[PDB]
Design a protein around this ligand. Structure first.
Ligand SMILES: NC(=O)c1ccc[n+]([C@@H]2O[C@H](COP(=O)([O-])OP(=O)(O)OC[C@H]3O[C@@H](n4cnc5c(N)ncnc54)[C@H](OP(=O)(O)O)[C@@H]3O)[C@@H](O)[C@H]2O)c1
Ligand SMILES: NC(=O)c1ccc[n+]([C@@H]2O[C@H](COP(=O)([O-])OP(=O)(O)OC[C@H]3O[C@@H](n4cnc5c(N)ncnc54)[C@H](OP(=O)(O)O)[C@@H]3O)[C@@H](O)[C@H]2O)c1
Ligand SMILES: [Cl-]
Ligand SMILES: [Cl-]
Lengths: 297, 297
């Protein structure tokens, strides 16, 4: 195991396929660990040739053998509990576990499933969406942000070696909250059932700036070092996206799947409470998102 | 025209079919005036035999001849402008025009389309929903509230004579706002994409009471005579509905049709402004509803 790097991908979805495709094109053979059987997985980046990554997608932990050197976790955070048996099977104390999930709670959520492994949280900036036809559409290059330190630097080496854009940030808390401001705001799309062009409306954009400011106060109390300019920057960013760009949580709502509402929006309320911060806009959005996700009704 | 009463139904949808069916069963032959051609329309009240009302549904004003004695308008308020040529064709100064729409702006919206006719606003309490199979499902009896005065009493006579439950209320402003508190709250269902059982959640119910109180302040400034008890009563009412009961605005959202968002929710903001009343919860809900309805995205 000194030369060949054993890599497992747990969660071969939009983000997982994006990463598996880069690894495959670089010549690695990641072990695909999923929920829905398939012979392989396919990534189509706009403007590029398709990349097909051979499987099979394994759907029982009994079918695979560990330990592996690197485990890339790309399930939704709603699926972390169900993914646990993959981590038990595949991780030991030398495994590096990369958690490619939104929010700011990656290590806290996943570390207990691999208690002796180094966990590398990874902020992913990309637009990836599974199509009805079975392949994943990637619009633009993906970029990842990880911390500094040995495990994170090893993981960044692996991805950079395969052609990925990765930043090792000595202030990961700030990087994670920066992405969370964007993802939290994108929750509006789930309630309206509209793509990014909804933010081009004056009324929505005004509301959006107030919400991002409310989220920003919480981010700062939690240690994020962000300028006041970020409020309007977030709103300009979503307005500048292609008019039909959605978000993964809207795709889940349209497929009637559980949402990462607590990871992306509930977290604002939960973290606000120790600091005694008010979140009046979140107090409206969060119950509607949680109901949308979990019912009843 | 002293004995036979000429009746036209403009808008043969969920509510329109509900009313047409009662009239038909009483022996009237209402002229059906619609948008989508059909040979007739069908009402199925739960627990009762189906009632089929013969058409055809006329879809051009050129195909019909007025004036009529009673015109029953049951289009959505989003369709009032498109329905105008029916009113021009069918109404004269002796026509009674009944407006079976939600909100509190019936006379203001419709009177200019029939400037010399008496307009009777009608608050409808019912649960009617067009099914994929083409017939309308009615769950429970329908009840209507109209004002007092000659035109309203003539209209109530006609419906009561046909077996309908109708109240002639000397304080119609209060009756209209009472229904609007319910309908405004039901907007939550459109954002969450869930039926009435969503209100059984603690978080939603807490938010709901705050929203109904915000709406109540506006209703009172506009002349509604409602007790403080109404806030919790509205929330108990939606919780007590069958778990799968929706609202017409959710059905429109699911069919990708324009919503009555301004009639049911935008009105709270618009009326609050002359009284200098704050509407912070509406300031969140309304832009999301308007975007859901009208895009872009
Ligand atoms: N999509 C984006 O553009 C994007 C961008 C940045 C960050 N993110 C974040 O990245 C994370 C992953 O998002 P995604 O969009 O890739 O989600 P996704 O497309 O829904 O992918 C999740 C994958 O995990 C599989 N899965 C479910 N349960 C599993 C289990 N017990 N074991 C193994 N695999 C399982 C799913 O299969 P089934 O669907 O068959 O259950 C699916 O293939 C989320 O935290 C998201 O917020 C997404
Ligand atoms: N459904 C309920 O349980 C309920 C209860 C109380 C109050 N209300 C209120 O009652 C009103 C009517 O609601 P609804 O649920 O009956 O709506 P609906 O089922 O959508 O009915 C509207 C009808 O008008 C037709 N139409 C559209 N444009 C037209 C035009 N230019 N001329 C003539 N007809 C036209 C529609 O046809 P297409 O669909 O083919 O366009 C449809 O048959 C609304 O204000 C609503 O808020 C509804
Ligand atoms: Cl490197
Ligand atoms: Cl009577």
């Amino acid at each position: 195991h000194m030369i060949a790097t054993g890599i497992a991908l747990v969660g071969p979805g939009a983000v997982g396929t994006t990463v598996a495709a880069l690894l495959h094109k670089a010549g690695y053979s990641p072990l695909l660990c999923g929920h829905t059987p398939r012979a392989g997985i396919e990534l189509r980046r706009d403007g590029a040739d398709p990349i097909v990554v051979p499987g099979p997608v394994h759907t029982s932990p009994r079918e695979v053998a560990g330990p592996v050197d690197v485990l890339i976790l790309a399930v939704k955070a709603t699926q972390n509990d169900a993914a646990r048996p993959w981590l038990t099977r595949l991780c030991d104390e030398r495994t590096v576990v990369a958690v490619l999930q939104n929010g700011v709670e990656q290590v806290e959520q996943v570390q207990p499933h691999c208690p002796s492994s180094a966990v590398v949280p990874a902020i992913v900036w990309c637009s990836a969406e599974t199509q009805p036809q079975g392949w994943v559409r990637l619009r633009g290059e993906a970029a990842l942000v990880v911390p500094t330190g040995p495990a994170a630097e090893q993981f960044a080496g692996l991805l950079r070696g395969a052609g990925a854009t990765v930043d090792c940030d000595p202030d990961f808390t700030t990087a994670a909250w920066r992405k969370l401001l964007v993802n939290a705001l994108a929750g509006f799309m789930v309630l309206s059932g509209r793509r990014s062009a909804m933010f081009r409306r004056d009324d929505v954009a005004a509301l959006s700036r107030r919400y991002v400011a409310e989220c920003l106060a919480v981010a700062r109390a939690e240690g994020a070092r962000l300028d006041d300019d970020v409020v309007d920057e977030v709103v300009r960013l979503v307005r500048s996206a292609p008019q039909d760009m959605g978000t993964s949580m809207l795709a889940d709502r349209a497929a009637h799947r559980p949402l990462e509402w607590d990871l992306r929006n509930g977290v604002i309320v939960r973290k606000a409470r120790a600091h005694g911060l008010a979140t009046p806009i979140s107090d409206v959005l969060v119950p509607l998102l949680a109901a949308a996700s979990d019912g009843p009704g």
